[PDB]
Amino acid sequence: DPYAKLFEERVIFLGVQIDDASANDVMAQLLCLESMDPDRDISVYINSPGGSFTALTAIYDTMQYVKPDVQTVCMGQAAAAAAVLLAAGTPGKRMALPNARVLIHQPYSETGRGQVSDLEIAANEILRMRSQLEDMLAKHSTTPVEKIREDIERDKILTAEDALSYGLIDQVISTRK
Amino acid sequence: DPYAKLFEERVIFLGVQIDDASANDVMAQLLCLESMDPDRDISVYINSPGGSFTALTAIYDTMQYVKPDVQTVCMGQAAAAAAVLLAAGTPGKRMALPNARVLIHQPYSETGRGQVSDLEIAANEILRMRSQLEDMLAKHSTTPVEKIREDIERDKILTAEDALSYGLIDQVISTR
Amino acid sequence: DPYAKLFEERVIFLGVQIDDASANDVMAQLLCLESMDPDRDISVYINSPGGSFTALTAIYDTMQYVKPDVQTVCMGQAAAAAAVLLAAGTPGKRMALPNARVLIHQPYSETGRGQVSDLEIAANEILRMRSQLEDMLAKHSTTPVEKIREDIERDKILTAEDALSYGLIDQVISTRK
Amino acid sequence: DPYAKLFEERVIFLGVQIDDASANDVMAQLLCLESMDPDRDISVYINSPGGSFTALTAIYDTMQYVKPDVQTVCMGQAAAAAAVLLAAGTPGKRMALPNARVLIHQPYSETGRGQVSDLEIAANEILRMRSQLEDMLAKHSTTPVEKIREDIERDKILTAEDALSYGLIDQVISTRK
Amino acid sequence: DPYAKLFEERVIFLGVQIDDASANDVMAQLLCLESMDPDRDISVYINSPGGSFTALTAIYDTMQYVKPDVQTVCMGQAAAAAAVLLAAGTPGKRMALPNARVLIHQPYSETGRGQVSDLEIAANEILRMRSQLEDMLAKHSTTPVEKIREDIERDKILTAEDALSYGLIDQVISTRKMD
Amino acid sequence: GLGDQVYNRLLNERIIFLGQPVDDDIANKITAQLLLLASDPEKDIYLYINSPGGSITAGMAIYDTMQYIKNDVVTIAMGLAAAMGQFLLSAGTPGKRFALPNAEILIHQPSAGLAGSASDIKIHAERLLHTKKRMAELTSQHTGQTIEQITRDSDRDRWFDAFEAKEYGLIDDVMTTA
Amino acid sequence: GLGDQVYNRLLNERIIFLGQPVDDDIANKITAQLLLLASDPEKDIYLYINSPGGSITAGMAIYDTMQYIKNDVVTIAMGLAAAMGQFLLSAGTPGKRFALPNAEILIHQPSAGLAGSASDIKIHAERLLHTKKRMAELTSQHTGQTIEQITRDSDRDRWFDAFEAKEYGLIDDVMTTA
Amino acid sequence: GLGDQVYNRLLNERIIFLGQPVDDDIANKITAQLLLLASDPEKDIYLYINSPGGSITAGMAIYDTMQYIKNDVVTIAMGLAAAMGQFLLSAGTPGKRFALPNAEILIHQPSAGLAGSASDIKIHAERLLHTKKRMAELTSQHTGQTIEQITRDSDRDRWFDAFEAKEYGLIDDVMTTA
Amino acid sequence: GLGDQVYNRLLNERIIFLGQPVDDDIANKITAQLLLLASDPEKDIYLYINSPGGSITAGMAIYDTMQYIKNDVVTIAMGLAAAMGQFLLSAGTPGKRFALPNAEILIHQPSAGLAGSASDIKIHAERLLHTKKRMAELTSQHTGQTIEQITRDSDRDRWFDAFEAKEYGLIDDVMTTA
Amino acid sequence: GLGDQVYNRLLNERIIFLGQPVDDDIANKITAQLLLLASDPEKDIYLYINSPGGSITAGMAIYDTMQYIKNDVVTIAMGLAAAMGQFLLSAGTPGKRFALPNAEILIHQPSAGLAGSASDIKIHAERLLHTKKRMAELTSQHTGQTIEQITRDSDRDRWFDAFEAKEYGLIDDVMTTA
Amino acid sequence: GLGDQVYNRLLNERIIFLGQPVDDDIANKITAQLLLLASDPEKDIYLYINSPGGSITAGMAIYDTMQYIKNDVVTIAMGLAAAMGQFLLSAGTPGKRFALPNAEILIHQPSAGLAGSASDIKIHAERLLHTKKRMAELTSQHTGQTIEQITRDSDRDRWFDAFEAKEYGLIDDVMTTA
């Protein structure tokens, strides 16, 4: 089992869309690896589309909560919440593969039927979620907040070099040679 | 698996919805943890979007029964019953991660078609359940019962600082 | 089981549709084999009918990144993205069975409901992806990019000898004397 | 389990339809058996009702590539692709049970909706596939190719003795006495 | 695990529908049992309702091929192909439980839509299949083939002693204590 | 087909049918027919209820129309008159309620279902109590029975033939071969 | 549709059909036709039966309507008359019930499953037994074959053809060419 | 069916029905009938309400047509006037709003759903708030109560019988006989 | 039954309705009605809109038929007029566009989907951009606003009411009473 | 109801509609209408096309019927008029083909599917190729372009507005007002 | 409704249609129309064919009715005449079978399925072979080609245009104009 060996060294691999179960698994893996050694470096590999915002916040807090450094590697794609997870790595060691792409846009939500007051409360919650996502993207990047407001209005697609110029990643790795 | 080793540490994880099966697993784990060592604390991580009321009562009673102090940490979210579980930890140990939320609202339920007497019995039971939830939230927090009664009338979303000012938690951790 | 024995002999076997899970499995196996021995060759066997483009890019980047040489063996068929994996092996170590076949054609995509602007960004992304695929085919073959552009307009079917003349493979297996 | 015991004795069952997974398992077993011993015969037992053409191609090529002789035994039935696999055994080592039947017919196919050019390409490919199949049948049998072309127009059912007289097999085994 | 334990003393259950997987498992077990010891009997227990015909012929050929004697025991019901398999045992070693039943009838078939030539070919194949079934039943019993043809027109249901007089089985076993 | 012509030719003789469970559409049809027939204030209207009840609101629409048109309404129970069908049967003008000799009559309490939050469930439970009490009060008013007798009898179910219903007070007389 | 014109022209001849299983709608339509034809008080109505039966209440409503009008209803059975079909077949005016020669008649006890709570199940079981007894008494009255004999015969399905029905008492004569 | 001719004669008598939930089709139908009857600018138009509510836009279209045709509209609650139904019932011309004695009325705030990106949710939330405010203001204007009174009384479901509605201001009088 | 008669009478006077989503069959029906009423060139035609939008091509066909005839078409918003409903509402003859006091008006860019190979996606993309540009140009022409302002406001899902539409230029007056 | 009457009154003026996708049913209807209108040797027939295309053989039947009769057929394109709709639009009497200004036009090659054995697939392939060649030849003959030009252009989807279609030769003139 | 009226008018003139696959209902309708039109034994009856075939027994009933009456039947193929559409196309009276210039004609052997026991399959296969032989014999008799030639040709699908069918003997002439 290759995944067994990858987790055995330091590697947590995130290749499925972000929902509650996957977030719980990632959190458990991070806590276990921190329990093994609170001074080594954990690696997180992102090849997933977006997902629920609550799971995104849970994983973000979990990475920001432990001592061990988190090295984010983008591969294939990292869209929506996965982009924030990629940008949430410790500075200087957030990297992406040459042909990877990063997609960012504002959260999409769908509430059930309900009275007007319930919809107003839900709308306030959604707006504060969007503002919080904006703040997270601004904190971990070199781009000012207003430019992020302009960018996340619609779908924004960035290449590896474009992401590096944006400040989401620090290095684009080509080959081991 | 990471869950087994986390259990070996002394951490119970509750990231799934609250039903009979999850409550049974949590109660069994709590009993085993108390049996192995009745002095060291038990950590419970909450990431659940609420669930059934009976399972909530069972888990709450089991938590209050055990000798070891139960430290409840909220990460991701804690909605409805999960809020009660988070606030039900031993005082001085309840804590939450920085940008998490706690959502509280009155119970929601539905019943099948039946005569008026059965519907009346069900309505009395649901009112009793809401009152019991009110008392549980009141005694384990700071705000008076009247404000909570006026507050859970609609959905109430509290951030970490809002929960701390509310009294549901005790201190917000950024890093361990 | 035979698959474990093949993996012990540094053979990664790919006979399933290229999606996120299969790509993740292939990437993990490649990383494990590279870690176990960074000098011996790794064999990849292709019997897949194609799949998504993101998994294609991820697998291609990983198989280019590792330091050991990668030998691609086509058999049965190698269609669309799989064909690229057949042509992305190290030069002189790409081969196919006598009766195998190869499919090459431009990407097919589908977008749901959306406003005109979102469809505009989506179409721009699809065109960029098709151009990237054209460049990938041009780099690893012996054919000018204009000829590839004209060829991949519709489905093109290449036999083993046609693939050999096209430059996608280096030699055709005949038998073990 | 009996299947592992027969595998230890260099015996392979093919008792399900010919698809990608079945072909992959069969060829992996063939390669492992060749690597275990390169001069002992390998037995293949056929009880399949047919399958996909590309998987048939891959299995046939793998059978022709391996060094050891391959002995094919048709037990219950061998229809369409299974007949070609049965006839593709090492000459003089092809057998069938007395109450066995072999069914041969031209390939069947269906295509989704598309423009006329795509349909023309698909029709050309299907004609090529039929030509390849009848070439394979003519190569491994004692029947002129035009006779096979005339015969495989419709379903043709052959008993064990009929298959022997057709050249598909070599012996019919009654009892061990 | 009881099934492996009976397999240790050379006993095989055929208690499911007769299809490709069941036939393959049965012949694999038969070949393994022959390889282990070529001169000790093999017991086959039949509790199946029937199945396909190609699997029937494959199992029948495998039973006839192996050197050791095959003793067939009917336990519950043995219908259609199961009746042929029960009658295909070594003569004098075919048994049935006292309240067992054996059902024999001509093959049933169904084909998809097609041109008339394909339908004619399929019908000829089905008639050949029925003739093969008739020959198989006539060979392993003491009844003239004409009576077989008359009988298998519709569902012919036989009890234990009716099958014994009919020639399909050789013995009816009541209890162990009574030998 | 033939149903339209037969129903129209019967309506020309002031006869109305209720041979199906009562809901919004049939309630609208019955109300419209009653209003149309109310053009003549002198002649009376015949009703031929045989149905297993239905919704309360449609039943009260029909009932309010019955007590408003100033015309005498004659109700006849033919098949099964249950739940709200019994209510509409007993809602006719006094002395003009009849049942065929082989009819069945059923009385029981209303039924419904609840869904929502605690507050909405509470409000709907109070409304269900109020409507059940109104049902019992109206039934006790139309029949010669006390409110306590009705609320005790309609706890689960109660079946009547023609003569038992006559003695109870649900109907006025059993009509045969008339 | 041809059915509409043929049914209209047949009803103009005082002929009614019952060619489908009895339910609420066909019972309502047949009752409407009977009441409409009851305007003429000295003519007779011919009713043809070809049906496998239906609900008890609808059949009893049709039976009550047949018994209520002063007109004599001549019943003719063609095809088959089973369960409620034969009950309405035998409900015709005495001396005026007929069956075509190749017609079958079937008799059996009622069957209607019911479920709920224990008390509701008990009440509904009592009601079912009461309806079974009423069915037996009515068919005994209409055939004159005592109650115990009918109860013994109706335990399972029993079949009759023309002459057996005539001698048993279900019908009165077997019609041939008029 | 017969319902078409019954409704046609009722329309000839200047009577309109709304015995079903409000949607685009029934709103177009009611508006068409109102426009057709507005040819005579002297006579009145009677409209019966029996509905559990419907879409806001359709009800507002009906209300605008009622206020536009300069003819008096007499509204009658006939069993249930909920949500938009009670709004249309109170929308009648002053002094010509009535309810039957056994009629149920209720009031509550509108309900809807949200889906889309953040900006779309924002805009639709603003528009829902605005339309809720307009509904409250229109109810306050028609009933004569205070805007805050209606806002506080419509947070949850609130029920009314005929007399409580009359004293509240939803209707003006309760018809009993004529 | 009644609806067909009412619509027939309304069309007989001068009136046309569009109270449903815009698609092929309703577009053909409205085009046929416009062509049929175009026999007399002196009189004008009144059209009412209560619609949440629809397909682009059907709306453009209706618009072209509206402009083709020399008759004057007076468009009246009658509830919700969104997307293509707004486009057809503003397409009336200048000085003859109206909205009732409680009417909702919405403007937004078209929406569609994409599927197929890269070249087909490309071609469909230029076609969608071209039709969006044409819609913006036509809206700017009819409303008197600048094309840039129309694009800015129609990118997102701006709402309106009667008076905001009047000041914007989508309509010419707010119609109240006759 | 109303749509059928409007279509009949339009047919009385020799106007034919070709909305909705073309299939066997609408092809039979159009052929029947053309044959019925052909009773007048010397008049004109107007055809409106708003269809996205459909069956090749049904369009061929319509085209042959159009060419068969002596009457001049004037085709007017409104809406989409794509695929076989375009072909039937271009097949009108020369000098009598028109399109409304805001009318799209699309041209592309036919599409189908393949299933069966190798021989049947082959035969169907030659038949499809022959059909495509015949379509190209007919388009070239009617539009006045060259066969190679038509084949090269109609490989993928190709779009025209009114004026590009006029220049290309698909239509003759663009109608703005009668 | 318009389709029914135009079909009635065409049937009034002389025209009959087969624009849909052949089955029991359509065969019954065409037999009815032919029997009704047979009242005049002088004037000829025109029959247009556009269908992909259908059931064998129904089409042979149509063919028998065609061959049974004394009137002359002129068959006209348009759009498509495949399988038994061709068979009924070739069944017309000699010298009176026509096809439109862009009409396609298909010939192939029948098809069916088998299910049951061995003996039932045997019987069904025998009668399928008999039906195929009868089809080939009738085709040879009507067209003029030999039986063996027809058998060789109708082993797979074969397609014809107008002129190949004319020379082959399937039709008598190609009709271009009137």
Numbering used by the authors:
A (entry chain L), C (entry chain M), D (entry chain N): 52 to 228
B (entry chain K): 52 to 227
E (entry chain H): 52 to 230
F (entry chain C), G (entry chain B), H (entry chain D), I (entry chain E), J (entry chain F), K (entry chain G): 31 to 208
Cite, word for word, the article reporting this structure:
The Clp protease system is important for maintaining proteostasis in bacteria. It consists of ClpP serine proteases and an AAA+ Clp-ATPase such as ClpC1. The hexameric ATPase ClpC1 utilizes the energy of ATP binding and hydrolysis to engage, unfold, and translocate substrates into the proteolytic chamber of homo- or hetero-tetradecameric ClpP for degradation. Here, we present cryo-EM structures of the substrate-bound ClpC1:shClpP1P2 from Streptomyces hawaiiensis, and shClpP1P2 in complex with ADEP1, a natural compound produced by S. hawaiiensis and known to cause over-activation and dysregulation of the ClpP proteolytic core chamber.
The resulting ClpC1 was used to form a complex with shClpP1P2 in the presence of the supplemented fluorescein-labeled casein substrate and ATP. Two distinct groups of ClpC1:shClpP1P2 were obtained at the resolutions of ~3.0 Å, referred as conformation A and conformation B, respectively. In both conformations of ClpC1:shClpP1P2, the six protomers of ClpC1 are arranged stepwise along a central axis, which is tilted ~18° away from the central axis of the shClpP1P2 chamber, forming a shallow spiral dome structure that is hooked onto the apical surface of shClpP1P2. The main difference between conformation A and B is the various positional arrangement of the seam protomers in the hexamer ClpC1 structure. In conformation A, only five of the six LGF loops are bound to the shClpP2 surface, and two empty shClpP2 pockets are found between the ClpC1 protomers P6 and P2. The P1-LGF loop is likely in an undock position due to loss of the regional density in conformation A. In conformation B, all six of the LGF loops are mounted on the shClpP2 surface, and only one empty shClpP2 pocket is located between the P1 and P2 protomers of ClpC1. Linear density representing the bound substrate of unfolded polypeptide (likely casein) was visualized in the central channel of ClpC1 in our determined ternary complex structures of ClpC1:shClpP1P2. Differently, the P1 D1 pore-1 loop is bound in conformation A but unbound in conformation B, whereas the P5 D1 pore-1 loop switches from the disengaged state in conformation A to the engaged state in conformation B. Notably, only ATP molecules are bound in the D2 domains of ClpC1 for both conformation A and B. In contrast, ADP is the major form within the ClpC1 D1 domains, except that ATP is found in the D1-P4 position of conformation A and in the D1-P4 and D1-P5 positions of conformation B.
